[PDB]
From a paper:
Kinetochores, multisubunit protein assemblies, connect chromosomes to spindle microtubules to promote chromosome segregation. The 10-subunit KMN assembly (comprising KNL1, MIS12, and NDC80 complexes, designated KNL1C, MIS12C, and NDC80C) binds microtubules and regulates mitotic checkpoint function through NDC80C and KNL1C, respectively. The 10-subunit KMN assembly consists of three complexes, the 4-subunit MIS12 complex (MIS12C), the 2-subunit KNL1 complex (KNL1C), and the 4-subunit NDC80 complex (NDC80C) (Bharadwaj et al., 2004, Cheeseman et al., 2004, De Wulf et al., 2003, Desai et al., 2003, Kline et al., 2006, McCleland et al., 2003, Nekrasov et al., 2003, Obuse et al., 2004, Pinsky et al., 2003, Westermann et al., 2003, Wigge and Kilmartin, 2001). Human MIS12C (also known as MIND complex or Mtw1 complex in Saccharomyces cerevisiae) contains the MIS12, PMF1, NSL1, and DSN1 subunits (synonyms are reported in Table S1A). Finally, MIS12C is a binding hub that connects the other two KMN complexes to CCAN through an interaction with CENP-C (Gascoigne et al., 2011, Hori et al., 2013, Hornung et al., 2011, Hornung et al., 2014, Liu et al., 2016, Maskell et al., 2010, Petrovic et al., 2010, Przewloka et al., 2011, Screpanti et al., 2011).
From the results of limited proteolysis experiments (Petrovic et al., 2014), we engineered a deletion construct of the MIS12C in which three of the four subunits carried N- or C-terminal deletions. The resulting construct, referred to as MIS12CNano, did not crystallize, but addition of residues 1–71 of human CENP-C (CENP-C1–71), coupled with in situ proteolysis (Dong et al., 2007; STAR Methods), led to crystals. We collected X-ray diffraction data to minimum Bragg spacing of 3.5 Å from a native crystal and obtained initial phases from a tantalum bromide (Ta6Br122+) derivative in a different crystal form. The MIS12C is an extended rod, with a long axis of ∼200 Å (1 Å = 0.1 nm), in line with the previous low-resolution EM analyses. The four MIS12C subunits have similar topologies and span the entire length of the complex in the same orientation, so that all N and C termini cluster at opposite ends. The MIS12C subunits form two distinct subcomplexes, MIS12:PMF1 and DSN1:NSL1. The sturdy arrangement of helices in Head1 and in the helical connector of DSN1:NSL1 provides a composite binding site for CENP-C. The main chain of CENP-C resembles a “horseshoe. Its first visible segment (residues 6–22) is extended and binds in a shallow groove between the α1 and α2 helices of MIS12 in Head1. The CENP-C main chain then takes a turn (at Phe17CENP-C and Cys18CENP-C) to move away from the stalk through an extended and poorly conserved segment for which there is weak electron density. The CENP-C chain bends again to complete its “U-turn” around residues 28–30, emerging in helical conformation (residues 32–44, Figure 2C; a more detailed description of the interaction is in the legend of Figures S3A and S3B).
Author numbering:
A (entry chain A): 2 to 200
B (entry chain B): 31 to 203
C (entry chain P): 6 to 22, 28 to 48
D (entry chain D): 116 to 155, 159 to 193, 203 to 245, 258 to 317
E (entry chain N): 32 to 204
Write the structure that this text describes.
Amino acid sequence: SVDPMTYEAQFFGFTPQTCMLRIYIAFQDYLFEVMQAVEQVILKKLDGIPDCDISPVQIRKCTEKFLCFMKGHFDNLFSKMEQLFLQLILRIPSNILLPEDKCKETPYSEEDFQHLQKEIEQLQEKYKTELCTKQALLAELEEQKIVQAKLKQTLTFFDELHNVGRDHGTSDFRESLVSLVQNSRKLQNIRDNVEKESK
Amino acid sequence: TISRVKLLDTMVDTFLQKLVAAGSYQRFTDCYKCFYQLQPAMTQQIYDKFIAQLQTSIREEISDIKEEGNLEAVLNALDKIVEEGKVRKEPAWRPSGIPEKDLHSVMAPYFLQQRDTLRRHVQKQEAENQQLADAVLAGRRQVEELQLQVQAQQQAWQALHREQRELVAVLRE
Amino acid sequence: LDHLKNGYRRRFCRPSRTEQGQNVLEILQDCFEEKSLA
Amino acid sequence: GITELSRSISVDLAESKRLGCLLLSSFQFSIQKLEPFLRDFSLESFRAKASSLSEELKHFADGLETDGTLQKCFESLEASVAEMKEYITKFSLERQTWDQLLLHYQQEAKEILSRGSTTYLGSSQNEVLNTKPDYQKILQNQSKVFDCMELVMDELQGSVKQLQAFMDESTQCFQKVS
Amino acid sequence: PREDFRVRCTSKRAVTEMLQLCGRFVQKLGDALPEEIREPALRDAQWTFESAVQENISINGQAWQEASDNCFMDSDIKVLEDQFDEIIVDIATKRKQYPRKILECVIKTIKAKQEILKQYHPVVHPLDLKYDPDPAPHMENLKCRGETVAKEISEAMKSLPALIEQGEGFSQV
C-alpha cells in the first residue's frame, strides 16, 4: 500500500492524491454553499406566511438531515470517482517511459564509469606529453640540420683542397713525398760518391 | 483510445448523474415535509434551483481546474506519450533511489565521445611522432657517416707526416 | 451546517491496477454502483 | 505497595482471566482504601453493598470475558504511517544526495572554466629523445680539426724549406766543379 | 526480580474502554455513604481503583504512563501527509530537472578541458642552444698555402732529377 506515485507526480508537478483533495474540498464546499442557498431562501420566504411560524430552528435541522444524507452519498460517490480518477487519469501506465529520462533505460556500471573517466584523464595527459615530444623531435631535427651543413662544409673544404692540389702538379702529397725522398736519397748517395772522388 | 479529457468529463457527468439520482425529489421531500404541505410547487422550484446550481457549480469547478495549469494540454501530452510508446508492453524504467546510477547513465555517452576523441587525437600524434622520430634517426645516421668521412680525409692528410719524417731523416748526415 | 468530514486521508489503504480491458466504459459503469444504501 | 496487587493471582489461566481477577482485586483494593476514613452501624451497612455489586462485578467480568470485549485487550493505519515515515526519510536522503551531487558539478564547471585563465616521462619515443648525441661537441671537434690541419700544413711548409736548402746547396756545390 | 506480573495487553484503548464500562459499579458503591463526603470519596475511590488497575497492568513491557497508544488523530495525519507530499513533489522535481543542469555543467567542463587542451598546442620548447661559427678567413688561407706547397714540391720534383743528371754526368768522364 501507501503509493507515493513518485513518477506519476514527476510529469504532472503534483501528487494526484493532493489534487483529488483540492477537488474534494472544492465539491464539498460547493454542496454546503447550495445548502446555505436553500436554507436562507426558505428563511426569507418564511417571513411571509399566514398561520403560525413552523420555523426557524425546526426548518434548519431538516436541512441538516438532508445535508447528512447528501454527505453520505456524495462522499461515497466521490471516493469511487476518485479511485476512477487515479486509475484512468494521472497515472503513468508503467508501459510508458517519460522522455525526460530517455537515456537512463540502459544502465552504465560504475566500474566502467570510473575506469572511463580515469582513462580520459590518462589520455589527456598522454596527449599532453606526445605534443611536446613532437616539439622536441622537430627541434632536434631542425638543429641537426645545422651540424649536417657544417660537416658538409668541412668536407667541401677538404675536396677543394684536393682540387687545389690536383692542379699545380701533385694531386695528393703521398706519392710525391715518397718519390721526393727516393730521388733525394740517390742525390745524397751520388753526392758522397762524388766527394770521395774529388779528393 | 479515449482522450483523458473525455474520460474526465464522463466521470464528472456520471458522478452528477448519480448525485442528482441519489438526491431524489422524494428524498428532498420526505425530510422537508413541514414545507411540502404548502405550495408543493415552490418546493419544486427550490429543489430545481438547488440541483441545477449545484451541478453547474461543480462542472464549473472541473472546468476551472482543466484551465488551472493547462491541464487539457498536459493530459493531451500524456495521451500522446502513451500512443507514442504503447509498443513495448514491458515494464518501463522506474527511477531507482540511486541518483549516481541514473546520473552516470545519462552522462555515459558524453564521456564515451570524449574518450574516443582524445583516443583519435593521441593516435594521430603518436603516428606523427613515430615518422618524425624515424626522420631524426636517419638524420643521426647521416651526421655520423659524415663525421666518419671528415675524420677519414683528415687522417689521409695526416698520413704524409711520416713521409716528411724520413725526408728530414735522410736529409741529415 | 459547518459540520463536515475534514480529514480525508490521501494515501491510506486502497488497491492498485489496468491494461487492455475492453475500452474501460464498462469499468466506468462498474466502478460506480458498488456498496452503499440509504 | 500497590504493585503487590499484580503478583497476587493466577499465572496459569491465560491472561484475560487474570485481567478480570485484576479487576476484582483492584475493586477490593479501592474499597479497602476508602475504609480508614469513616466519620459516621454505618460500617455494617456498607458491606451489604460492597459484597453485592462486587459479586455483580464478578458476574459482569465473567459474562463479558466470553463475548469478546475483555479479550479485545490483547489485539492498518499504523503500518501505513510507518511506511510513510520511512519513505519521507529515504526521500530526504535522496534529496540531499541530489543537492550535493548538483553543487559538486556546478562548482566543478565554474572552477575548471575559471582555471585556464587565472620531453616528458612515459613518452612514445622516450628511447629516441634520450639517445641524443652532443652536437656542440662535434662542432668543437671541427674547430680543433682545422687546427690540426693548420699545424700539419705548417709542418709540410717547413719541410719544403728543409728540402729547398739542400737543393740550393747541392745545385751550388755541383756548380763548383769548375 | 521476576517482573511482568502485570497483564500483557497489546492495546491501551481496550483497557480504557472496559474500565470506563466497569466504572459504574464503583460509582454505584457510593449509595451507602454519607452525602457530606460521598463525592470526593467516590473521586478517591475512582482514582485509587483505576490507578490500581493501571499500576498492575502493562501494555508491551511498558508502564501505563510511559506507553504510547497507536491512535493517531487527524492533525498528525494532515501534517505528516503534507510534509510527505512536499518531499514527493520535491524529489520528483530533482529527478526531472537536476540531471539536465548537471549535464549542462559537465558538458561545459568537458569542452572546456578540450579547449584548454587545444590552446596548449603552442608548447614551444626552444632547445637548440648551439655553438659559435668559425667561417673561412683562414680556410682560403690554408687553401692558398696548400697551393704554394703543392706547386713548390711539383717544381722540386721537376728540378731534382736534373741535379741527379748533373751528378751522374760528373761520375764517369
